[PDB]
Design a protein around this ligand. Structure first.
Ligand SMILES: CCCCCCCCCCCCCCCCCC(=O)OC[C@H](COP(=O)([O-])OCC(O)COP(=O)([O-])OC[C@@H](COC(=O)CCCCCCCCCCCCCCCCC)OC(=O)CCCCCCCCCCCCCCCCC)OC(=O)CCCCCCCCCCCCCCCCC
Ligand SMILES: CCCCCCCCCCCCCCCCCC(=O)OC[C@H](COP(=O)(O)OCCN)OC(=O)CCCCCCCCCCCCCCCCC
Ligand SMILES: CCCCCCCCCCCCCCCCCC(=O)OC[C@H](COP(=O)(O)OCCN)OC(=O)CCCCCCCCCCCCCCCCC
Ligand SMILES: CCCCCCCCCCCCCCCCCC(=O)OC[C@H](COP(=O)(O)OCCN)OC(=O)CCCCCCCCCCCCCCCCC
Ligand SMILES: CCCCCCCCCCCC(=O)OC[C@H](COP(=O)(O)OCC[N+](C)(C)C)OC(=O)CCCCCCCCCCC
Ligand SMILES: CCCCCCCCCCCC(=O)OC[C@H](COP(=O)(O)OCC[N+](C)(C)C)OC(=O)CCCCCCCCCCC
Lengths: 68, 78, 94, 168, 68, 86, 89, 341, 469, 185
């Protein structure tokens, strides 16, 4: 009811991926709902930033041991 | 006692005179509080018809046009 | 270092009985304070909630006026005296 | 000032066996379309509540002896009984609109009301003081609130365009 | 009278030296004729102005800084 | 007003706060570089003041009417790297 | 996310292992609510969302009313007993 | 950050010296109302009395009773002064001529006027004796009961202008001061201000405890001095709230035509003469209202705690919860809801 | 209708003395009856399980919630008649059962908080409503402040209910931290499988369930139901359990939890075992409410659990009212009054009640055998449906524990009946005073429904196969 | 200069730990309430650090301004006895205190993540290593702040919760009266 609203009264940071996921839920029934996996994973990545964080941990490892 | 309550259901107007005389601090508070919602209900359409209408709303955001894109030119590179 | 930031640091560092109206006044200060503080968002969003959130806050205030009405007519905050002046009548059996 | 919907809705959803008129009817239409059955139900509850406490005082009096209840309770009784009766009648009419009950007379009256308004150029369901986003918020708050009549009353007063009919 | 015109006219009447002396001794400015001086050297004055209420017509100007 | 002795301390208070307000005005003005102080600034106005600091050489509230920017403007762009919140 | 969890845990432990009085229990409840609001507001910032701050303001209201009701209940206990002893409820 | 230091020291000197001479102004104003004079012997017309009362109290013993606390009787006056002083930061003497210049200045003042109560709360705990702990309770119930009424006025006027910036609230008063459409709120705000400072005719506890062996502020030495620089500053502060909320603050006659006639350019003279005029309007307003605190003190007798709590919760609050309904209605009738700027 | 009741009563009660409290209770009783009669046609909207979202997406209205609303009102028109119709017009029964002024307001506010819970669709409405239901019920325990035990009770219930509101809010804020949502409709098979939310949702279930006495935190609520007055115990013991269990049943949170299986087993064992040595009535009936909470917990694990829940919650509520009503009527025929608030405490005080009023004991037997699950009483057809659902979904060890718990609970249920049909010296032979008419008719009507409502089971099944399917 | 204000959040964390231990250990409860006020202040500080001074001020004018005034208003009037912290009475809880601390902390930290392996759920919580970029856009046109947004949604989208909080506050009025005030007449 107050979902998708920011602190300035506008669209949040991760709204767009939520919109794509909700679109693809409306497109699909519970059997075909598996198609909504990558959209949901994109949403979770925007929220919690895990895969990008691990990417940067790999970069930092290369800057850390392979140089010293 | 000297100036006790005569009861709202045993004469409204007589109760209202008693209250204005002995309990103004409630009576004029009720009158204030009732004068807002009631006037908002009653006088607003008169003001909208005769004095002036209601203002056109403010933009609030970029007014994205409801159309399809058009091919333009001018101001291109070179 | 801002002048507010410079100032907001400098200044500090350079058995018995009671009547229950004494306690009700504090206990009731809470909800009325929360009412008047919850009214802040309305006054700062009053335009954007034009004529809808107006009516909403009025029903809010009226509901709160009900509880105030209950408080007044109970006479909670009044202090009550025990050593009453006699008002019986003087009657002599004959 | 545009009165053009921001959000899609259903077109002619069937809440019952009979066709639809409105899904968020304004308080005015609900009160103007009331059948006499509704006003009789108003007076039934208006008389049945104070009569109920008199019936009860006859059955188990408050003291040892029957005495008719004081006019104080009877007045409060009549007020609440009118409130119950109006809530029932506001519901009975609203359900004639949703398509849950027989709605022949209400179908024809709306078809007449709407054609006359289109003839006069007026917007069907009317023009509002509000921005369209608040119109949509109002319809979302107020739609099908009569289902909560046991808990709270809620009523539409906004003249939004999100009623559940085809665009024309 | 407690008005400013009083002190201004008085300071015009009696000179600034007497003004600073009166300010350092009495706390008020006062101007009036001399009536005489005693054996200790203390001078005694009298006023006639309308502005001066009862019990403020006659005043003293002590000689010693440690007046008593 | 008759009782000047009673109004003198009010004259002290009046003159002290008066000179305090005028002196603070000149100090804020000298801080800003010859312009009255801003107030009630929001996100936009701050972001634009930062853009001014990018176009002038960091000279505060100095404005520039040139239709075309110096080439440093394209490379003076700042992003802001924030600490993780815990 | 850290500070809120820490105040919450320590205040739950001081609520549970209080053999002394009751005002500590009231205080630990209020601190638990505080830590919750801090958790939630941190998440609301990181997501740039408003539902968190809405639930936070609602918690503030409800917690103040909680303390009001609790401190009337204590006053009832005291009415009857006259002393709130260390190990009484 | 040098001029920031200059600006702080100017402000602190001006405010503290204003407090010191508000003591003398209180006494001489009250005297001439009583057909006497003075202090007019400790200086050139008494302009050094306040510093004499201070220096006497700083060379006075720091004596602590046997069954008392030390730390509470010491820090509590100190924290009272601090909390009362930081409210001065958000107070403008020109358009943006403010040390804070926050966008939440109203809410800062309102939260700090809520922190103020703790001085009276901790005073009663400085005396383990039993009656003082009830006398502080009387004096706390007056403050927390009257802060509801001061706040409610902050909200009523912010319905007119939808911003918590103090300068913005004052700049909207170019058109009209908010004491003209809401004149009764001027009385109410001034009454409640006099109450929150526990000033006469609302000085119940200091008098009720001056008779009794305790239940008052039986301090000595430096804590006396801080409590008397925190009372006479909370007075100016609450008078300032009246000023920038209802009386136009720094506003005055439009000095457009004059400055146009006399200057021709924006120099470092016009800025000075402008800031002088603005602050002078703000100052004379504070002077008239400090006079009014004294004027009230000289006349009216005292209240009792029952009359006082009854005055608040049964007479004032109903009128305000009425005004909460009439003003939004008055805006809705005429299509005049203010914008966020 | 509740709101206009609560609003009107505040004014009308402040205007009214202590002497009108019974008539005002009678008024709101009749008003609730007029609601339940005249607005009941709204069940048509929920044809073919048409479900509606209201006030945005905060509330949800389906046939489940509507029936729960009618039940809470039927409970609240019977619980009010107990305060507004005096049993006997004697001085003793005036002093024993006299309503207070603010009681009825707190009842209706607790009705409101109960209904906002079941109707909730977002966690924010749940948190606001559970706080409303919780705060109202702190005060209801405490309103009889002239008793020491109730004062102790409200204080403990405040603290141990506050702790659980903390647990609930901690769970909600975690769900929001993970998913950026306060709505459970934002779940589905994808999001359940894809995300580790098992811990984050069982913490919700437990924080709600420990507020209803689920084991091993049963004792505090049992001490409360024992220590509070009987006519308050009959309300606090029921309505909070209906509300929270209905919210957890409607939202299919814990489909196949292992923790819930363990705790529900422990409740059936505790509530069956620990209630055997009890000599007091209220503790006995509280342990009974616990084992029934165990049975109803066992259908949080099913995903198709509406009929079994609705039938059991209805017969439980009916039997629960009726048995407490029998205990209230029997106070006339005992010899010793223990208190002004709890006139009857020990089960051995009902001795010989058959020789005084036998048809009161017939009602007690019908109600007891209904609790046990003896057909053709309604309790059989309720525990049968639970057995059908759990065996249809794959819980076998739990069905055996269920059978075993029913047998063990027969003993503390039959203690009442055994002492009641015992013999007694100094019997009653005549009494010119007479119990009220209304309370007798209410008790009778509940008895006749427990007895003969098996006749309508097919009709109920047909209506369910339309409006819930 | 830059990094003088880098560890303020860790400082507030350490200070909140201290104030909790002090609330638990203090002799006279009045001191424990003062430490609770210190804790609410530290929370208000932290909220300013993360960009929510509005809630800092609402806390200072709600919690401290009313709730703690009331807590002192109670303990000033009631005879709340105590039992000073000891070793004979409270040491027995040390094993359970420690077990409860470790488990509750590690669970409260693992709970916030969606990884399937347990140890990684905590090692994700301990991954606070990387900085968050802040970009500047130009789409926000108004001067809407958090309080204005709260008013908009609370009074439009979530009106029902407001019109229920009114009834919560009615309870806050009406329950305490019924409990304290004996309507003998
Ligand atoms: C009885 C009223 C009789 C009537 O029909 O009045 C029509 C009248 C409008 O008259 P009109 O000139 O012909 O305009 C027709 C359209 O309605 C005008 O359309 P519009 O677009 O111009 O609408 C403008 C605005 C106009 O509204 C206003 O600004 C008027 C302000 C009136 C203040 C109150 C008096 O309408 C609103 O936005 C009102 C929002 C309604 C909010 C929902 C309130 C319903 C709940 C009531 C029960 C309480 C809830 C309890 C639940 C608690 C939860 C636990 O509307 C109202 O009376 C609103 C009263 C709301 C009271 C509740
Ligand atoms: C044009 C017509 C204006 C109508 C004015 C109404 C007259 C009010 C009559 C009155 O004077 O109130 C007296 C009444 C009883 O007072 P009393 O006899 O002295 O006994 C109390 C002590 N036991 O006092 C009371 O019962 C309590 C009244 C308290 C009022 C304070 C709150 C005022 C709120 C103003 C908003 C008005 C709208 C409120 C309506 C609520 C609707 C939900
Ligand atoms: C509660 C009961 C309240 C009902 C009060 C109704 C009083 C009706 C008074 C009618 C006067 C009408 C004068 C007028 O025409 O006002 C127009 C004027 C607009 O100013 P303008 O610069 O011209 O901008 C207009 C752009 N469309 O200015 C205006 O639009 C506003 C005029 C305000 C008139 C005073 C209203 C307050 C009356 C006292 C009630 C409040 C007391 C507290
Ligand atoms: C409210 C008062 C305020 C204080 C609050 C304190 C913080 C609260 C902590 C969290 C909330 C409390 C939770 C209450 C316990 C119930 C938790 C639960 O039941 O979740 C279980 C759930 C799986 O259960 P289920 O879904 O039913 O079955 C499917 C299984 N695949 O999900 C799970 O599988 C659980 C995940 C397994 C990992 C659990 C984490 C334990 C880690 C602790 C390690 C300790 C180290 C070793 C010992 C140290 C001692 C020296
Ligand atoms: C300081 C300078 C000093 O050194 O003091 C010099 C004098 C002496 O002070 P005084 O004796 O108390 O005043 C004299 C009181 N006659 C009574 C005795 O100050 C003053 O009069 C006032 C100094 C100017 C006031 C500034 C405002 C008659
Ligand atoms: C409802 C008031 C409950 C208060 C307690 C009184 C019991 C009334 C039961 C009627 C239920 C119904 O008739 O409904 C059947 C419901 C669904 O139908 P519905 O959507 O709710 O429409 C009903 C529309 N009414 C209200 C206008 C009628 O199926 C169920 O799962 C209900 C299981 C209940 C089992 C209890 C049986 C008790 C025997 C009743 C003998 C008269």
């Amino acid at each position: 009811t107050a979902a998708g609203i920011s602190l300035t009264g506008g669209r949040n940071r991760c709204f767009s991926e939520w919109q794509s996921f909700m679109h693809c839920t409306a497109k699909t029934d519970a059997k075909s709902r598996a198609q909504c996996l990558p959209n949901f994973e994109d949403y979770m990545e925007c929220l919690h930033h895990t895969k990008e964080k691990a990417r940067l941990r790999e970069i930092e490892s290369v800057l850390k041991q392979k140089k010293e | 006692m000297i100036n006790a309550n005569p009861g709202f259901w045993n004469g409204p107007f007589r109760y209202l005179r008693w209250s204005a005389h002995n309990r103004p601090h409630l009576f004029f508070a009720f009158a204030i509080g009732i004068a807002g919602p009631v006037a908002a209900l009653t006088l607003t359409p008169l003001r909208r018809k005769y004095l002036y209408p209601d203002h056109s709303p403010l933009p609030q955001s970029y007014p994205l046009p409801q159309r399809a894109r058009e091919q333009l030119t001018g101001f291109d590179d070179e | 270092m801002n002048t507010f930031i410079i100032f907001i640091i400098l200044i500090p560092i350079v058995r018995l009985a009671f009547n229950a109206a004494f306690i009700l006044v504090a206990i009731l200060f809470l909800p009325f304070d929360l009412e008047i503080s919850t009214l802040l968002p309305y006054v700062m969003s009053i335009y954007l909630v034009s004529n809808y959130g107006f009516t909403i806050v009025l029903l809010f205030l009226l509901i709160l006026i009900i509880g105030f009405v209950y408080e007044i007519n109970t006479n909670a905050l009044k202090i009550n005296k025990h050593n009453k002046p006699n008002t019986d009548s003087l009657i002599y059996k004959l | 000032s545009s009165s053009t919907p921001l959000v899609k809705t259903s077109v002619n959803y069937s809440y019952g066996d009979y066709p639809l008129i409105d899904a968020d009817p304004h308080f005015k239409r609900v009160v103007g379309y009331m059948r006499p059955s509704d006003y009789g139900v108003i007076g039934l509850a208006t008389a049945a509540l104070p009569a109920g406490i008199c019936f009860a005082e006859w059955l188990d009096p408050v003291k040892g002896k029957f005495a008719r209840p004081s006019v104080k309770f009877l007045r409060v009784a009549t007020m609440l009984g009118f409130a119950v009766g109006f809530g029932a009648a506001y519901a009975r009419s609203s359900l004639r609109f949703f398509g849950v009950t027989e709605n022949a007379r209400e179908y024809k009256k709306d078809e007449a009301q709407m054609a006359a308004r289109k003839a006069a150029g007026l917007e069907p369901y009317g023009t509002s003081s509000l921005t369209p986003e608040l119109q949509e918020i109002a319809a979302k708050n107020s739609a099908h609130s009569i289902a909560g009549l046991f808990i709270f009353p809620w009523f539409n007063f906004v003249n939004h365009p999100y009623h559940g009919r085809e665009q024309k | 009278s407690s008005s400013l015109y009083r002190v201004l006219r008085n300071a015009w009447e009696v000179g600034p030296r007497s003004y600073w002396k009166q300010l350092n001794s009495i706390g008020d400015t006062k101007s009036g004729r001399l009536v005489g001086t005693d054996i200790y050297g203390n001078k005694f004055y009298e006023t006639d102005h309308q502005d001066e209420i009862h019990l403020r017509t006659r005043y003293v100007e002590y000689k010693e800084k440690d007046y008593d | 007003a008759i009782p000047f002795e009673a109004l003198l301390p009010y004259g002290i208070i009046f003159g002290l706060l008066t000179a305090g307000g005028g002196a603070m005005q000149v100090l804020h003005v000298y801080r800003n570089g010859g312009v009255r102080d801003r107030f009630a600034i929001d996100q936009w106005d701050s972001q634009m003041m930062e853009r001014d600091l990018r176009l002038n050489g960091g000279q505060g509230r100095k404005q520039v009417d040139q239709a075309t920017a110096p080439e440093a403007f394209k490379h003076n762009h700042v992003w802001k790297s924030e600490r993780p919140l815990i | 996310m850290f500070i809120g969890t820490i105040i919450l845990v320590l205040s739950f432990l001081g609520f549970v292992f209080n053999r002394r009085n009751i005002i500590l229990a009231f205080i630990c409840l209020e601190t638990m609510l505080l830590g919750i609001n801090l958790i939630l507001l941190r998440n609301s910032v990181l997501f740039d969302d408003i539902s968190g701050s809405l639930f936070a303001i609602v918690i503030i209201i409800l917690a103040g009313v909680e303390s009001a009701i609790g401190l009337s209940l204590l006053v009832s206990y005291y009415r009857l007993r006259g002393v709130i002893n260390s190990y009484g409820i | 950050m040098i001029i920031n230091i200059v600006e702080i020291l100017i402000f602190l000197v001006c405010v503290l010296f204003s407090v010191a001479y508000l003591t003398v102004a209180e006494r001489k104003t009250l005297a001439y109302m009583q057909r006497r004079l003075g202090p007019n012997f400790v200086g050139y017309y008494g302009l050094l009395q306040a510093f004499a009362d201070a220096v006497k109290l700083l060379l006075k013993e720091i004596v602590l009773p046997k069954e008392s606390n030390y730390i509470i009787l010491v820090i509590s006056p100190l924290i009272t002064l601090i909390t009362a002083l930081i409210g001065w930061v958000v107070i403008p003497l020109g358009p943006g001529i403010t040390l804070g210049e926050l966008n939440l200045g109203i809410l800062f003042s309102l939260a700090i006027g809520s922190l103020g109560v703790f001085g009276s709360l901790l005073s009663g705990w400085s005396s383990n004796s039993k009656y003082s702990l009830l006398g502080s309770i009387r004096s706390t119930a007056q403050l927390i009961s009257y802060e509801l009424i001061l706040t409610s006025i902050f909200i009523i006027i912010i319905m007119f202008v939808s911003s918590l910036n103090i300068t913005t609230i004052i700049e909207t008063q170019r058109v009209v001061w908010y004491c003209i459409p809401l004149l009764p709120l001027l009385l109410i705000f001034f009454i409640a201000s006099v109450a929150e400072t526990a000033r006469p005719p609302f000085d119940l506890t200091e008098s009720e405890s001056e008779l009794v062996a305790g239940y008052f502020t039986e301090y000595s030495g430096s804590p006396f001095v801080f409590f008397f620089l925190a009372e006479y500053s909370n007075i100016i502060l609450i008078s300032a709230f009246n000023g920038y909320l209802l009386l136009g603050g720094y506003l005055s006659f439009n000095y457009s035509y004059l400055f146009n006639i006399l200057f021709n350019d924006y120099s470092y003279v016009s800025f000075l003469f402008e800031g002088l005029i603005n602050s002078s309007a703000y100052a004379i307003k504070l002077v008239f209202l400090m006079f009014s605190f004294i004027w009230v003190r000289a006349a009216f007798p005292r209240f009792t705690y029952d009359n006082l709590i009854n005055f608040c919760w049964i007479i004032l609050l109903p009128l305000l919860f009425g005004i909460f309904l009439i003003i939004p209605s008055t805006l809705y009738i005429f299509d005049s809801f203010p914008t966020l700027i | 209708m509740l709101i206009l009741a609560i609003i009107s009563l505040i004014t009308f009660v402040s205007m009214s003395k202590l002497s009108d409290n019974r008539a005002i209770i009678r008024l709101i009783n009749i008003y609730l009856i007029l609601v339940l009669v005249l607005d009941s046609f709204l069940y048509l909207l929920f044809l073919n399980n048409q479900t509606y979202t209201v006030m945005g997406e905060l509330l949800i209205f389906n046939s489940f919630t509507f029936y729960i609303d009618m039940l809470i009102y039927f409970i609240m028109i019977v619980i009010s008649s107990l305060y507004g119709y005096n049993l006997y017009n004697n001085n003793l029964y005036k002093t024993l059962f006299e309503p207070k002024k603010e009681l009825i307001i707190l009842f209706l506010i607790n009705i409101l908080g109960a209904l906002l819970i079941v109707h909730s669709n977002d966690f924010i409405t749940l948190f606001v409503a559970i706080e409303l239901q919780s705060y109202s019920i702190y005060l209801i325990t405490a309103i009889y402040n002239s008793s020491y035990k109730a004062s102790k009770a409200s204080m403990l219930y405040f603290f141990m209910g506050g702790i659980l509101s903390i647990l609930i809010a901690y769970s909600i804020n975690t769900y929001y931290s993970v998913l950026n949502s306060y709505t459970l409709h934002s779940l589905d098979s994808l999001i359940i499988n894809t995300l580790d939310l098992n811990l984050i949702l069982i913490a919700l279930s437990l924080g709600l369930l420990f507020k209803i006495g689920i084991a091993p935190l049963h004792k505090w609520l049992i001490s409360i139901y024992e220590n509070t007055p009987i006519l308050i115990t009959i309300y606090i013991s029921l309505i909070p359990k209906i509300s929270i269990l209905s919210y957890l049943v409607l939202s299919n949170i814990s489909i196949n939890s292992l923790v819930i299986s363990i705790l529900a087993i422990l409740t059936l064992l505790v509530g069956s075992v620990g209630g055997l040595l009890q000599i007091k009535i209220k503790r006995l009936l509280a342990f009974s409410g616990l084992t029934n909470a165990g049975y109803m917990m066992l259908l949080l694990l099913l995903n198709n659990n509406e009929f079994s829940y609705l039938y059991y919650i209805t017969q439980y509520s009916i039997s629960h009212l009726a048995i407490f009503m029998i205990i209230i009527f029997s106070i006339y025929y005992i010899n010793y009054i223990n208190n002004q608030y709890n006139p009857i405490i020990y089960v051995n005080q009902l001795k010989g009640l058959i020789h005084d009023n036998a048809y009161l004991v017939l009602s007690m037997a019908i109600v007891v055998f209904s609790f046990i699950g003896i057909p053709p009483l309604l309790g059989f057809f309720g525990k049968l449906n639970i057995l059908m659902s759990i065996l249809n979904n794959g819980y076998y060890f739990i069905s055996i524990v269920l059978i075993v718990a029913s047998l063990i609970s027969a003993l503390y249920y039959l203690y009442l009946l055994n002492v009641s049909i015992q013999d007694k010296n100094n019997i009653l032979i005549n009494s010119n005073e007479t119990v009220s008419s209304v309370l007798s008719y209410i008790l009778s009507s509940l008895i006749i429904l427990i007895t003969f409502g098996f006749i309508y089971n097919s009709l109920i099944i047909d209506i369910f196969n339309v409006y819930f399917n | 200069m830059m990094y003088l204000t880098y560890y303020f959040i860790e400082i507030t964390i350490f200070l909140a730990i201290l104030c909790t231990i002090f609330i638990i250990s203090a002799k006279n409860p009045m001191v424990s309430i003062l430490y609770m006020i210190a804790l609410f202040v530290i929370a208000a500080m932290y909220l300013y650090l993360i960009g929510l001074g509005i809630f800092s001020l609402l806390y200072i004018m709600i919690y401290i301004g009313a709730i703690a005034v009331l807590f002192l208003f109670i303990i000033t009037l009631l005879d709340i006895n105590s039992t000073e912290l000891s070793v004979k009475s409270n040491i027995r809880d040390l094993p359970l205190v420690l077990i409860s601390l470790i488990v509750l902390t590690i669970s409260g930290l693992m709970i916030y993540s969606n990884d399937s392996i347990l140890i990684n759920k905590l090692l994700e919580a301990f991954g606070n290593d990387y900085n968050t970029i802040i970009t500047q856009d130009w789409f926000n046109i108004e001067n809407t702040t958090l309080l204005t947004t709260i008013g908009n949604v609370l009074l439009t989208n979530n009106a029902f919760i407001l019109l229920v909080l009114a009834i919560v506050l009615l309870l806050g009025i009406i329950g305490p009266i019924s409990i304290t005030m004996k309507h003998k007449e």
